C-alpha cells in the first residue's frame, strides 16, 4: 500500500524530469532496506541483476549524509561502488533525501535524463517537492 | 501537523518559482468545504494584515472546489464566477489553478513575464498538486 504511493511519486518524478530511470529506497534506522521501488527496468533484467540494492556507493553517501546530489557521471564519484552485473549503465544522476524534519527515511533518485544532458536546477527543486510528499507518507506508515 | 505544513509550503514555493508566478497559494478543505489549511507566497505580512480575513474559497477558487478541473485564465477577474478581490488584496490577472486530489486547490497568479501560464506550466503544477494530495491523504 505504501509502496503503491511511493511508486506513484517515482513515476511522477521520472516523467517530469524526463529521466530514463527512477527509484526510491526507504530504510530503517540501521539503514536496512525496507522498501525499494523503481521504474524504467523490465522484469527480466531485474531477475538477471538478481539482488536488491543494499544502499551502498553513491546511494550510501545520500543515506549517510542526506543532501541533494547531482552528478554528470555517477560512476566518477569517489563514493561510487560500481554497478552489479546486468544492471543498466547509468551516467547522469539526481538524488534527494526522503525525509521529515526529525528524520531521514530514504532517497529518491533519477538517472540518464533523456535529452543526454545533466539534470537541471529546476529538476532538483521539482524532485525535492515530490520527495517531501513521500516523506509524509513514510512517516505516517 | 508541522511536517505536512512544511511540505505544503515547499510545494507552493516550488510551484511559484518553477512557473515564475508572482503569487502562489494552496487551500485545503474537508468534504464539508471548511478551510483546513491556507498556505501562500508573494505577499508580505503588512499586506496580509491589511487584507484581514482569510479566504473562504469563493469566486473562481470556489468553482475549482465544487468542480475540480484545471483552470487557466488570462484574466481571473473577467471570469463570470469571479467575486472580486477584497480591499487591500493585490489585484491579480493571469491565473492557473488545479485541484489537489479532491482535498483542495493549488493556484498561481501573475506570471512575471506578463504572459498567460503555459501548457507545461499546467502540467508541472498539476503534478505538484498530486504530490500535495498524497501528503494530505497520508496526514495526519
Ligand atoms: C530503475 C532505477 C534504478 C536506478 C536509478 C538505479 C541507480 C543506481 C545507482 C546510482 C547505483 C550506485 C552506483 C555506484 O555507486 O557506483 C546503483 C547500484 C546498485 N543497484 Fe541500482 N538502480 C536502479 C534499479 C535497480 C534494481 C531494479 C536493482 C535490483 C533489483 C538494483 C540493484 C542495485 C545494486 C545491487 C547496486 C549495488 C550497490 C548496492 O547494493 O546498493 N538497481 N543503482
Ligand atoms: C499570495 C497568493 C494569493 C493568491 C494567488 C490569491 C488569489 C486570489 C484570487 C484570484 C481571488 C479572486 C477570486 C475571484 O475573484 O473569484 C482571491 C480572493 C480572495 N482572497 Fe486571495 N490570493 C492570495 C493571497 C491571499 C491572502 C494572503 C489573503 C488573506 C490574508 C487572501 C484573501 C482573499 C479573500 C478574503 C478573497 C475573497 C474570496 C474568498 O473568500 O475566497 N488572499 N484570491
From Swiss-Prot, chain A:
Signal peptide: none
Source domain of life: Bacteria
Record's note on what induces expression: A member of the dormancy regulon. Induced in response to reduced oxygen tension (hypoxia) and low levels of nitric oxide (NO).
Places the protein is found: Cytoplasm
Domain GAF positions: 1-138
Residues that bind heme: 87
Further comment: The dev nomenclature derives from the increased expression (differentially expressed in virulent strain, dev) of these genes in virulent H37Rv versus avirulent H37Ra. The dos nomenclature derives from experiments in M.bovis showing the same genes are essential for dormancy survival.
Record's function text: Member of the two-component regulatory system DevR/DevS (DosR/DosS) involved in onset of the dormancy response. Regulates an approximately 48-member regulon. Required for full induction of the DevR (DosR) regulon; acts later than DosT to positively regulate expression of the DevR regulon during adaptation to anaerobiosis. Characterized as an oxygen sensor; O(2) acts as a switch, with O(2)-bound Fe(2+) protein inactive in autophosphorylation. Has also been suggested to act as a redox sensor, or perhaps as a dual oxygen/redox sensor.
Name by which UniProt lists this protein: Oxygen sensor histidine kinase response regulator DevS/DosS
Species of origin: Mycobacterium tuberculosis (strain CDC 1551 / Oshkosh)
Parent-protein start and end of this portion: 63 to 203 of 578
